[PDB]
Coordinates of N, CA and C in Angstrom, one line a residue:
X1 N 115.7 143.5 72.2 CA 114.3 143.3 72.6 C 113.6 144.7 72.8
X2 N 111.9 144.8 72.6 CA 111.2 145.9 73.0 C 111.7 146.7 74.1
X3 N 111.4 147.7 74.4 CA 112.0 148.7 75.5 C 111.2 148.4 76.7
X4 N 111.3 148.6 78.4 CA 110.8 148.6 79.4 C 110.9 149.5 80.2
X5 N 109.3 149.7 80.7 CA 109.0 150.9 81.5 C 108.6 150.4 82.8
X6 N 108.4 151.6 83.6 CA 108.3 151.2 85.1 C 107.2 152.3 85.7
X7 N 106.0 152.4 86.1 CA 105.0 153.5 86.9 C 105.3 153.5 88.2
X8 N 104.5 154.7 88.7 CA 104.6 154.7 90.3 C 104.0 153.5 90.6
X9 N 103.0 153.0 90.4 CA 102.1 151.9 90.8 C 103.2 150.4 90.8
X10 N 103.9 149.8 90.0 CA 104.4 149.1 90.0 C 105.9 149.2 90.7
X11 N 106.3 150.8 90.9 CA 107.9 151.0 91.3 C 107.3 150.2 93.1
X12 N 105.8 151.0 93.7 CA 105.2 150.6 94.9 C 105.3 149.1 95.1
X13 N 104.1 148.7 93.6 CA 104.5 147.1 93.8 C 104.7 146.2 93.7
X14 N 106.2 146.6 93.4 CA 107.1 145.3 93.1 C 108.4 145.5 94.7
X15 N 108.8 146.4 94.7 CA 109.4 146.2 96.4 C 108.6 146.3 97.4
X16 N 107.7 147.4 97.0 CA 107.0 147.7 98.5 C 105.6 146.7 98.9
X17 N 105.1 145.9 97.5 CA 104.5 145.2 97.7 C 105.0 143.9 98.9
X18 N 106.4 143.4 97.9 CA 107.0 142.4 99.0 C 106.7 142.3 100.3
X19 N 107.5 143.5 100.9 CA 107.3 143.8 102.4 C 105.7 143.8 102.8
X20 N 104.9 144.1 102.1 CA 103.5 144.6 102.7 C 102.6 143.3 102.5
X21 N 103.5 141.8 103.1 CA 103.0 140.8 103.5 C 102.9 139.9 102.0
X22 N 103.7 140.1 100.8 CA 103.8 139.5 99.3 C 104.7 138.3 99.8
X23 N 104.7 137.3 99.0 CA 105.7 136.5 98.9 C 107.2 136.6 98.2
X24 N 107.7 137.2 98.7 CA 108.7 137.6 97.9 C 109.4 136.0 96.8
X25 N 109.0 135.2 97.2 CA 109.9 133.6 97.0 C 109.4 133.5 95.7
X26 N 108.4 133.8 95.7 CA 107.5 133.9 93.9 C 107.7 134.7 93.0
X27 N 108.3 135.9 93.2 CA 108.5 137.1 92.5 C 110.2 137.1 91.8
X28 N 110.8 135.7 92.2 CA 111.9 135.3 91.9 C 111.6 135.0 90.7
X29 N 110.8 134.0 90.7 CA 110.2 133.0 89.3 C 109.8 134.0 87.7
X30 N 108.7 134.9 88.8 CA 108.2 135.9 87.7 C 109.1 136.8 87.3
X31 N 110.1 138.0 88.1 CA 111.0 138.5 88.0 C 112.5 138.0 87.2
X32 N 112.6 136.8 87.2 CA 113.6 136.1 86.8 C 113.3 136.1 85.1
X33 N 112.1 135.6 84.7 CA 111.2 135.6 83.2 C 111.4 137.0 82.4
X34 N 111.3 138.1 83.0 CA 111.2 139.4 82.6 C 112.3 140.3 82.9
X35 N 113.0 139.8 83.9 CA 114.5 140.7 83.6 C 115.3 139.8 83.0
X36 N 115.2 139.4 82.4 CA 116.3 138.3 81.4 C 116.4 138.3 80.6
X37 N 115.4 138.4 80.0 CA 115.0 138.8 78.3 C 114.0 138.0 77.3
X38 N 113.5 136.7 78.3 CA 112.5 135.7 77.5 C 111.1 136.7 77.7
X39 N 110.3 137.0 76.8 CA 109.2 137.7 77.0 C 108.2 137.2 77.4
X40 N 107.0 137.7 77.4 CA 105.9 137.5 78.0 C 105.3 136.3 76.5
X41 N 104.5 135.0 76.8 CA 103.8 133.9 75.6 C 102.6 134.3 75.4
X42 N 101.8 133.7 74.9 CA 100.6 134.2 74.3 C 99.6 133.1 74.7
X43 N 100.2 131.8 75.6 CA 99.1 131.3 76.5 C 99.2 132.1 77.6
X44 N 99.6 133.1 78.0 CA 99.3 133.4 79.4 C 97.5 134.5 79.4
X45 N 96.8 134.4 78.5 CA 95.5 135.0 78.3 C 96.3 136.1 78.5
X46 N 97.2 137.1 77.8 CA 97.9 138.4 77.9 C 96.8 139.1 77.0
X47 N 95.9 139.8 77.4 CA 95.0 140.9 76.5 C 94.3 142.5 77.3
X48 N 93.5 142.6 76.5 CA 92.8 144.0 77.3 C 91.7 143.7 78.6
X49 N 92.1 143.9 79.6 CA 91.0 143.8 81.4 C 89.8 144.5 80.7
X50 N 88.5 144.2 81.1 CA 87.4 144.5 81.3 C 87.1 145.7 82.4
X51 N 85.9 146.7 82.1 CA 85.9 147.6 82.9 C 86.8 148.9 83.2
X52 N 87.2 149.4 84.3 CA 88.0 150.9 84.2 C 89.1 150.2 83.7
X53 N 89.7 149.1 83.8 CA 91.0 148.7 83.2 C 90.8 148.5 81.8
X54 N 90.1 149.1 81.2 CA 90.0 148.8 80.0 C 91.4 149.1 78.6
X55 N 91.9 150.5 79.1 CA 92.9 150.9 78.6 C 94.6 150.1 79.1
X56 N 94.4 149.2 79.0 CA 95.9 148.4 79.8 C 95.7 147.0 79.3
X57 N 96.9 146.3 79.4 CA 96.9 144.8 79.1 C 97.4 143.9 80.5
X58 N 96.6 142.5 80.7 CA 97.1 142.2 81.8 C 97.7 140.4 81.1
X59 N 98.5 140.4 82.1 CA 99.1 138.7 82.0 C 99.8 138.2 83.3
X60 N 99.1 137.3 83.5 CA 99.4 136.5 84.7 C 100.8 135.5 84.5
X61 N 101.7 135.8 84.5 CA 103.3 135.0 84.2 C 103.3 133.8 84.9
X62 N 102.5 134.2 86.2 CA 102.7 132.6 87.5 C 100.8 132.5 87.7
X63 N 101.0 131.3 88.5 CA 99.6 130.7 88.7 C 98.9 131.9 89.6
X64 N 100.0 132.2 90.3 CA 99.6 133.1 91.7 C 100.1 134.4 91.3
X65 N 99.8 135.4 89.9 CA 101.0 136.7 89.7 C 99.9 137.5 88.5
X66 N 100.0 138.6 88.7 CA 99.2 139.3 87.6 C 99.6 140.7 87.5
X67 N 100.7 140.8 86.0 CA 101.7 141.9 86.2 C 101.1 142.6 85.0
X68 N 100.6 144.3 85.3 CA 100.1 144.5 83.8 C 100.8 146.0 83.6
X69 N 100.9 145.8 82.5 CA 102.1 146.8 81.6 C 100.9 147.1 79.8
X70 N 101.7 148.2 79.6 CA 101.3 148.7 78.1 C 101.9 148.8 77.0
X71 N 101.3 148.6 75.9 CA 102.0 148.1 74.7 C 102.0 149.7 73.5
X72 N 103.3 149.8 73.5 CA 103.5 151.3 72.9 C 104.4 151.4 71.8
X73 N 104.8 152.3 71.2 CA 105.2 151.9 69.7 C 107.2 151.7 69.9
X74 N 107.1 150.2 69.1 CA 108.3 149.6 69.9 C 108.9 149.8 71.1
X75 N 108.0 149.8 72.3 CA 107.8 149.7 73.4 C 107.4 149.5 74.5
X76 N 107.6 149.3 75.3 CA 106.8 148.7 76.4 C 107.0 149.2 77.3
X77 N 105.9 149.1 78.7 CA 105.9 150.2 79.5 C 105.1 149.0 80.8
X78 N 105.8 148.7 82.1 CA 105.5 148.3 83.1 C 104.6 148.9 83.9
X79 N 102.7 148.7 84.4 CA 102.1 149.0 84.8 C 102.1 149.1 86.4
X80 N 101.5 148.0 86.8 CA 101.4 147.2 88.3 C 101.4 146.0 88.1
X81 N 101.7 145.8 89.4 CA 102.1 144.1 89.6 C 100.7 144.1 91.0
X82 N 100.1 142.3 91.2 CA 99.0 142.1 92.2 C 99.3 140.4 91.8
X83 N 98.1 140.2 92.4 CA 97.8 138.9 92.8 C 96.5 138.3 92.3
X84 N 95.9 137.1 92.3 CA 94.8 136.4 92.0 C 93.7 137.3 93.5
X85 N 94.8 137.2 94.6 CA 93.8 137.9 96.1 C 93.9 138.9 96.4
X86 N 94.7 139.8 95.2 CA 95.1 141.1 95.3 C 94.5 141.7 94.2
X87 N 94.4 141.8 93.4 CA 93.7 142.5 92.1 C 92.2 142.1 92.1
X88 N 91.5 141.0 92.9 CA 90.5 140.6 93.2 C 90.3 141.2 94.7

């Protein structure tokens, strides 16, 4: 499978999010999806954010999850991770 990357933004929050009041019980679901090796589908509206995010792709994996990463040549590169009440 494509290669995976990790930023400061996402190294913060994906553990340090947890603790800073995240649901960890959820991040099982999503983290379970993407460390395994099934990739990200093409109903999850995965494309380019509007505005300063304009350079990045986002995709929401869970109802409640919005993890965005960049698409690079045969690779891939993990942005940040938020929320529907967190990225909003």
């Amino acid at each position: 499978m494509l290669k995976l990357n990790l930023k400061k933004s996402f190294q913060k929050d994906f553990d340090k999010l947890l603790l800073n009041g995240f649901d960890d019980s959820v991040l099982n679901e999503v983290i379970l999806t993407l460390r395994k090796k099934e990739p990200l589908d093409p109903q999850f509206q995965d494309h380019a954010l509007k505005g300063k995010w304009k350079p990045f792709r986002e995709c929401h994996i869970k109802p409640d999850v919005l993890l965005v990463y960049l698409v690079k040549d045969d690779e891939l590169i993990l942005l940040r991770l938020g929320s529907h009440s967190e990225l909003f």
